Structure 1
Amino acid sequence: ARQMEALNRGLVAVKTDGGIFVSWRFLGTENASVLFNVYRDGQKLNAAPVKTTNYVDKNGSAGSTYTVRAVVNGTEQPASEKASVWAQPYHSVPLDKPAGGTTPKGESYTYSANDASVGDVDGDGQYELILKWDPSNSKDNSQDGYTGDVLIDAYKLDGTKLWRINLGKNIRAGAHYTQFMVYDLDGDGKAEVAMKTADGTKDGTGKVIGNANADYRNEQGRVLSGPEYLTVFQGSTGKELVTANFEPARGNVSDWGDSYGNRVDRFLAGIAYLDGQRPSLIMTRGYYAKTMLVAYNFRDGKLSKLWTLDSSKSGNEAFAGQGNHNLSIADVDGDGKDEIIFGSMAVDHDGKGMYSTGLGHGDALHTGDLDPGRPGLEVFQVHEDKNAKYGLSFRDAATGKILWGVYAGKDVGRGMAADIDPRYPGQEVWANGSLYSAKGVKIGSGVPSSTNFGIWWDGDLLREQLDSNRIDKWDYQNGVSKNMLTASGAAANNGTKATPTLQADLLGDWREEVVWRTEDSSALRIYTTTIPTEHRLYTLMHDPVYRLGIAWQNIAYNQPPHTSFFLGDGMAEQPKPNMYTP
């Protein structure tokens, strides 16, 4: 059994024209025989216990409050936490927008709300939002220039700002720099926050790490010298718990494949259950050429290093040049322990390189049960090298064997995987203007109008699409996308990537919520679906691959999360998660 979060009922109630829509979690600790009673202000609404974890109360009002009681072995359990009614289709979390600044070159910049993650920092079973702020002069690794400070905040859903960490002048702003992990690493029931830090990083209590005044910014506005640190911060306070020297260490900038400072600063990170029971922290560096991955534990108040994979070591040459601007984490070989899907290569739970497809770097990656007729997980990936044998590859996750691929002869920058067509079993995949079945059979002539995120939003087991401030649904019979939601007043992030601040099943039933910032970053808006469903599934945060996907969603070029099992049309009934909570 794996350590997973002790979650509350996640009860939510939302005003609609047809009454109050109520939804809640089916928890990983609950059996299939569990049913529910719904109460409005202490009065039961349903004559018989309901199975599905959504309910429409036609008689409810904006002033109503709700509780749910589980019915276990014929006996009603204590009431859930109380839920009030959302007067809007989204819940707003007001933000403390940081003031703008000026760089040493006299350039002004302002802040916008950017990537988020979630963790329960106080252990009450409700997630907090951990938000990264982005200065308007943040930089790709290919670009020279100074950047504003990167700020990381924690908010409760009620709008309480718990803390701000300022990573300081020695941490450059941009997609590929700070990769922040939020997770209960030590198993006490409370999340911590881990990331790369430097001299001058200021914790949530205002304490500066290392050499407070050291300035290692070069004239390119890059930080290519000086110490580098790894810090675990307390989730509730942002206080520094432990700081160690960061590995993978920089060495020489040129070790990584250029001298101007691009390849050296290509970071990814993850949470992986390397021991099959408890989480470990993964920090990576490099992917275009030299590539390193290091694993750590944070347990019993100590940070410990577990292993290193270094492509520059004799025997590891095949593990250079393969990584994406993203990764996945999953138990692919069935031993209960997590492996790392690092673009075109994979790394075992003990840090040993498993395989490389040799197809090289790409920009999108999907690891899940894509072909439910083929035992094991599958990885769908796209490839940037115009001379790659395949521009899109669909492989056995464990062995790396290519099941099918298609030559593109060009950079294929986007690819998606989602069950959008029930006429073909399993998840469809699309890239480079074509849609395919899980078996590689081209379907029709179109593709969905986005190739970004997949989201479970409506009531059916097919997956919808998310891009920018929109949720769309694929009309598979007619081969066209149609809009389901346009979140007016909400904005996506990261320029052409057009990503939400976060997509995750963070409250209510199994459908995924979306967190988008407002245009002016004065608030985050959490949208939860009010489309009824006949289906009950365990909260996705209790799935061992989905939960890990939420932890890495922020990293570099944000990718959508996947479940460890096939969730889609014609799916088998999912088994209870094998888990315990702290």
Structure 2
Amino acid sequence: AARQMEALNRGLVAVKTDGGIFVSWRFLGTENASVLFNVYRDGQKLNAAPVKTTNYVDKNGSAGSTYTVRAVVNGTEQPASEKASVWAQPYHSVPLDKPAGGTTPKGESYTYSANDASVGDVDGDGQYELILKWDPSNSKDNSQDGYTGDVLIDAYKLDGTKLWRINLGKNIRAGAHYTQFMVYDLDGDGKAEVAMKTADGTKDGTGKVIGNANADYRNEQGRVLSGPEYLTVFQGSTGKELVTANFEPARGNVSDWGDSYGNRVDRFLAGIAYLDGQRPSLIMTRGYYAKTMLVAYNFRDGKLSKLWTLDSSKSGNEAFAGQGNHNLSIADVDGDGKDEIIFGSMAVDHDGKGMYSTGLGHGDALHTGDLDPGRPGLEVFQVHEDKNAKYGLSFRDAATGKILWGVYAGKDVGRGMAADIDPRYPGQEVWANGSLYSAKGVKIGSGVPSSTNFGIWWDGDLLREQLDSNRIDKWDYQNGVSKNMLTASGAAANNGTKATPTLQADLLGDWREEVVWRTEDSSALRIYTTTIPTEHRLYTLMHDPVYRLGIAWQNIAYNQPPHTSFFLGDGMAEQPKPNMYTP
């Protein structure tokens, strides 16, 4: 059946290039193969015949010019899109209200840098707002003791209007593995809510404190190991607390999670999953090294509701322990139209049953998509941390978990990538541990892409490019070397050596993905959209069931790139029209 997706505007963007005014727009999933377009500069039509593809270069437009696009459905023109002005720079600059540094109880001062982002349409105007986590200098991996400054989540319209700031406060430790924020229209009112784990002292967008404004559950290591734990759905448009229930999976004893000093307990992941196969559910997960819990929520009709819990420590679920990554994927792997949860080396079914465990355990990178088009169903490429794992890299049937192939590594293979980078081999290539492989497992020559981080559809072809740091690279499959396509100067990635963008997403223009990177001084976010023309028209990736969810989970823990439900790549079958509705 049809999934709830977002009512998007035309996402019409206009960028000044050397070649003229590059203009792209969304091919909406509401629209048919027969939909064509007309581009208007300042009110006059630029194309003789309606164009098929959703990008256009206006060789005569200037910076002052404004663009609209008109669809042509079934013979007749449609009402104009929103007016788009031309970006003077190849990025749009979103000025941030940069929070002042602070002092921890220990006298240590910290500063803020803009960190992981997510997007939602929070005021329902058809355009994505940027939901931005601020990270304090002293933020901590679960293994490191020390106090951390307050986590701050801002929401920004692309014009730079700071809608609100949520201050998570003293009782939410700052760090990659702590706050996993879900930004999504959970209840289908066309506006996104922001849901995340909150604590006493959490100050919402209106300046209201959740729970006990004065409670301080920070232990002397600056961890928060006692005290209540909340889940708050916030109103997107105001940052107003909508509902706050107690967080699940509950902490219990720190030790249940496989250590006593407070590491494994605070290993959060979060997702959006269409578990009913139609409307989004919220997934909050705790732990992955040993004890592992996934609980599913619906936020609907102003009510937060627990859908199910999977608990590794509950009898029968033994296999589903120690399998989680610092990331997850959400997809319909059994073709039943409901989403399952690729949870590293294990998969949780749409009803919360553990489907399989490869038993290969924890890893730092996970890739779920149609990695092998010549095989029906989805494949999961996964790398594994444990040096004695049967494989360091596994390539498995996403549905059954049966390993189609793996390669024994012998060490911590800490990065893995799937992407169609080589058209000489049908499907997405995978690379980890100094070797690039075909979907079938055949080692492709020698050499790998210079990054094993993100893949991004950035240029005009169906091959995916690589993203790492402030760079987008392209794989020269014939020569076996990576080539740089973009270095975003003055922009920087986040999360140290994970070097993730603030966000990567198709959030404006055509099917290629935008990168959002904070400036070095986090005074602004830079939205880069591609100006490389493509002859391919694809539905906005944000209307792809697997991709859109992928964006929801991008921020979580160790940011993975988003994948599409269908094989998008060289020799792909014409893509399915998405089975969707908007509110």
TM-score by length of 1: 1.00
Unaligned segments of structure 1, at least 5 residues: none
Deviation >4 Å, runs of 4+: none
- Residue 212 of structure 1 deviates from its aligned partner by 1.3
User: In the aligned structure 2, how far is the partner of 1:197 from the partner of 1:488?
Assistant: 35
- Residue 17 of structure 1 deviates from its aligned partner by 1.3
User: In the aligned structure 2, how far is the partner of 1:414 from the partner of 1:381?
Assistant: 9
Which digits, 9 at most, give the CA deviation of each residue in 1:321-344, with x for residues without a partner?
Answer: 100000000000011100000000
- Residue 539 of structure 1 deviates from its aligned partner by 0.3
- Residue 174 of structure 1 deviates from its aligned partner by 0.5
Name the counterpart of 1:249. 250
User: In the aligned structure 2, how far is the partner of 1:241 from the partner of 1:115?
Assistant: 23
Name the counterpart of 1:528. 529
User: In the aligned structure 2, how far is the partner of 1:510 from the partner of 1:247?
Assistant: 36
- Residue 569 of structure 1 deviates from its aligned partner by 0.3
Name the counterpart of 2:190. 189
- Residue 367 of structure 1 deviates from its aligned partner by 0.2
User: In the aligned structure 1, how far is the partner of 2:186 from the partner of 2:14?
Assistant: 32
Which digits, 9 at most, give the CA deviation of each residue in 1:269-311, with x for residues without a partner?
Answer: 0000000110000000011011111111110111111111111
SS of structure 2 residue aligned to 1:499: coil
- Residue 427 of structure 1 deviates from its aligned partner by 0.3
User: In the aligned structure 1, how far is the partner of 2:438 from the partner of 2:208?
Assistant: 54
Q: How does 1:362-377 map to 2 (within 5 A)?
A: 362-377=363-378
- Asked if 1:105 is matched to 2:130, the reply is no
- Residue 555 of structure 1 deviates from its aligned partner by 0.3
User: In the aligned structure 2, how far is the partner of 1:288 from the partner of 1:475?
Assistant: 37
User: In the aligned structure 1, how far is the partner of 2:298 from the partner of 2:16?
Assistant: 44
- Residue 100 of structure 1 deviates from its aligned partner by 0.3
Tell me the percent identity: 100
- Residue 18 of structure 1 deviates from its aligned partner by 1.4
Which digits, 9 at most, give the CA deviation of each residue in 1:10-61, with x for residues without a partner?
Answer: 0011111111111111000000001011111111111111101111111111
User: In the aligned structure 2, how far is the partner of 1:452 from the partner of 1:421?
Assistant: 17
Name the counterpart of 1:228. 229
SS of structure 1 residue aligned to 2:326: coil
Name the counterpart of 1:379. 380
Q: How does 1:391-430 map to 2 (within 5 A)?
A: 391-430=392-431
Name the counterpart of 2:15. 14
Which digits, 9 at most, give the CA deviation of each residue in 1:434-453, with x for residues without a partner?
Answer: 00000000001110100000
User: In the aligned structure 2, how far is the partner of 1:412 from the partner of 1:106?
Assistant: 38
- Residue 521 of structure 1 deviates from its aligned partner by 0.4
Which digits, 9 at most, give the CA deviation of each residue in 1:55-103, with x for residues without a partner?
Answer: 1111111111111111111100111111111111110000000000111
User: In the aligned structure 2, how far is the partner of 1:277 from the partner of 1:478?
Assistant: 45
Which digits, 9 at most, give the CA deviation of each residue in 1:89-140, with x for residues without a partner?
Answer: 1100000000001111110100000000000001111000000000000001
- Residue 312 of structure 1 deviates from its aligned partner by 1.0
SS of structure 1 residue aligned to 2:202: coil
Name the counterpart of 2:356. 355
- Residue 470 of structure 1 deviates from its aligned partner by 0.6
- Residue 575 of structure 1 deviates from its aligned partner by 1.6
- Residue 540 of structure 1 deviates from its aligned partner by 0.3
SS of structure 1 residue aligned to 2:536: coil
Name the counterpart of 2:177. 176
Which digits, 9 at most, give the CA deviation of each residue in 1:412-444, with x for residues without a partner?
Answer: 000000000110000000000000000000001
Which digits, 9 at most, give the CA deviation of each residue in 1:151-202, with x for residues without a partner?
Answer: 0000000000000000010100000000000000000100000000011100
- Residue 466 of structure 1 deviates from its aligned partner by 0.5
- Residue 554 of structure 1 deviates from its aligned partner by 0.1
User: In the aligned structure 1, how far is the partner of 2:579 from the partner of 2:301?
Assistant: 24
Name the counterpart of 2:465. 464
- Residue 314 of structure 1 deviates from its aligned partner by 1.0
User: In the aligned structure 1, how far is the partner of 2:98 from the partner of 2:17?
Assistant: 31
SS of structure 2 residue aligned to 1:270: strand
- Residue 546 of structure 1 deviates from its aligned partner by 0.1
- Asked if 1:75 is matched to 2:76, the reply is yes
User: In the aligned structure 2, how far is the partner of 1:215 from the partner of 1:486?
Assistant: 43
Which digits, 9 at most, give the CA deviation of each residue in 1:199-245, with x for residues without a partner?
Answer: 11000000001111011100110010011111100000000111111
SS of structure 2 residue aligned to 1:545: helix
User: In the aligned structure 2, how far is the partner of 1:575 from the partner of 1:405?
Assistant: 30
Q: How does 1:202-217 map to 2 (within 5 A)?
A: 202-217=203-218
The aligned length equals 582
User: In the aligned structure 1, how far is the partner of 2:389 from the partner of 2:252?
Assistant: 30
CA root-mean-square deviation: 0.5
User: In the aligned structure 2, how far is the partner of 1:147 from the partner of 1:62?
Assistant: 44
User: In the aligned structure 2, how far is the partner of 1:503 from the partner of 1:572?
Assistant: 25
Unaligned segments of structure 2, at least 5 residues: none
User: In the aligned structure 2, how far is the partner of 1:502 from the partner of 1:420?
Assistant: 22
